[PDB]
Amino acid sequence: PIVQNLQGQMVHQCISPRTLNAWVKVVEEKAFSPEVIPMFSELSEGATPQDLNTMLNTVGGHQAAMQMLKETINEEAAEWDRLHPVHPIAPGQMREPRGSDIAGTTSTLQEQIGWMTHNPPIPVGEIYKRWIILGLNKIVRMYSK
Amino acid sequence: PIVQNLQGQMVHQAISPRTLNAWVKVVEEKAFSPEVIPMFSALSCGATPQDLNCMLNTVGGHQAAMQMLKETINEEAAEWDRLHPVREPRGSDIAGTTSTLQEQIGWMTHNPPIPVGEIYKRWIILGLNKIVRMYSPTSILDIRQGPKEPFRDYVDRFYKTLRAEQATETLLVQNANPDCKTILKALGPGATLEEMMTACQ
Amino acid sequence: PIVQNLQGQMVHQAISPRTLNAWVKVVEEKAFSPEVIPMFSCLSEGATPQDLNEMLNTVGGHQAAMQMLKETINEEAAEWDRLHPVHAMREPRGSDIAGTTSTLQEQIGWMTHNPPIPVGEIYKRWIILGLNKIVRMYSPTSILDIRQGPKEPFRDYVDRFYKTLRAEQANAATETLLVQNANPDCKTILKALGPGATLEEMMTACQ
């Protein structure tokens, strides 16, 4: 995740083993009960796209659900590109992120941190987490009998 | 776990006991389930070759898998030297076998940086991939929906298996049971998984 | 360990209760299984000789094994003396590197000198040498007694074989023995694969 250092600057921090373990256990134990979603939102505070992918990829079972989630992410990525096309200039500001950059597939960790910690910040972690939550909502609804 | 937020020099934080134990436990508990790969890649965030070796060397059980891993690491080290005949890091330096911690820090924090930690992690993951494929209990060809199996459960087994062989959804539809297959054929290509799971619910 | 206190004082750290408890737990739970050696080597990363001694003293048993480690370090301490005369801050003797006759401040001085005299890393090497000897000693089974069972999957036998091998050792010979010790059917297959086969290929063939 991104965190504030002792001098109040935005820096990258490794996802803790407590965070990693908590998420894996939630998913295993709650399955796709509704309470999965708020837990995800708590666990992923300040997460980069890479961190969000870590969380999704670490889930072992429920591969039907995870495949649905990947489809929803792809849909949201496509919609992003349609609505926010990329505008050869970098004076200290970066490129415009495309859908696949927000999903962490075609962006580097360094680029994600650059976007997230910019002034003004380009919230790629929050945007990706929105897409993920959209997907999880669908899964929760489907799995409700 | 490396950071430079120290003072005079970069601070390699000795990899935490929590991290080391979590990795050992994952391997012991999960056999070589595909989720081990992301887990490793996350537990080793920014880690130096020394830290990676620590993780691998602490693994009490499953020595057969590790040796395979050792073979794959050696293969990749040899390939590195063949492509980069060379201080500049050699294959065994990237694997942490013939490099010192200080040399590793020097390369990782150099300008331009030589990310020896990330290169080594990549090689390890290459080896883990091979192991995961080995340890896949079922072929994709043997996943067919049972006459009384809910489609959700069949899809779960199907994609678990597919993940294991680290291709087409046409097989997913072809191996479904007669009723559900009939409906999936009618939905066409470009039906989403949500729509397919809804249709056979 | 080393840190830069205030302006940059080069002072000795603590060793964390979490580290010490994890180490104590490994030792109590895993006896002297070979994996304990890398684990020690990682838990003691950057340790001063005093820290290393603290870790070793906090063990909670295993008799004179430590004493065996003590013997090995004395031999190396004598070897250090042979190799380190009064050359052409002071020069470290064997007992200085082992933390018996050196002060914490001298240890820090050597470790933080330019050029640095890595007394912590040299002592750690000697400790590992002793632990390796212990592990080989505590090995309950000979490599020659790992034989694949009549109904045992090849993968399980290879797991047993390399576990034992690690203990016994800390090579062509070994892979030749691995094939020799397999059961009749899988041995037939392995012999059929020909020379130069990797362990991956051997495991695949008998799967």
Swiss-Prot record, chain C:
Q: Superkingdom, according to UniProt?
A: Viruses
Region Dimerization/Multimerization of capsid protein p24: start-end pairs = 138-207
Q: What does UniProt say on post-translational modification here? A: Phosphorylated possibly by host MAPK1; this phosphorylation is necessary for Pin1-mediated virion uncoating.
Chain positions covered by the region annotation Interaction with host PPIA/CYPA and NUP153: 57-88
Q: What is the effect of changing Q50Y?
A: Increased interaction with human NONO
Enumerate the subcellular locations listed in this protein's record, separating them with semicolons: Virion
Effect recorded for A88V: 3.4-fold decrease of PPIA-binding affinity
Phosphoserine modification sites are S16
The function of this protein is: Forms the conical core that encapsulates the genomic RNA-nucleocapsid complex in the virion. Most core are conical, with only 7% tubular. The core is constituted by capsid protein hexamer subunits. The core is disassembled soon after virion entry. The capsid promotes immune invasion by cloaking viral DNA from CGAS detection. Host restriction factors such as host TRIM5-alpha or TRIMCyp bind retroviral capsids and cause premature capsid disassembly, leading to blocks in reverse transcription. Capsid restriction by TRIM5 is one of the factors which restricts HIV-1 to the human species.
Subunit and partners = Homodimer; the homodimer further multimerizes as homohexamers or homopentamers. Interacts with host NUP98. Interacts with host PPIA/CYPA; this interaction stabilizes the capsid. Interacts with host NUP153. Interacts with host PDZD8; this interaction stabilizes the capsid. Interacts with host TRIM5; this interaction destabilizes the capsid. Interacts with host CPSF6. Interacts with host NONO; the interaction is weak.
| Protein name in the entry | Capsid protein p24
Q: Which organism is it from?
A: Human immunodeficiency virus type 1 group M subtype B (isolate HXB2)
Q: Which residues of the full protein are shown?
A: 133 to 351 of 500
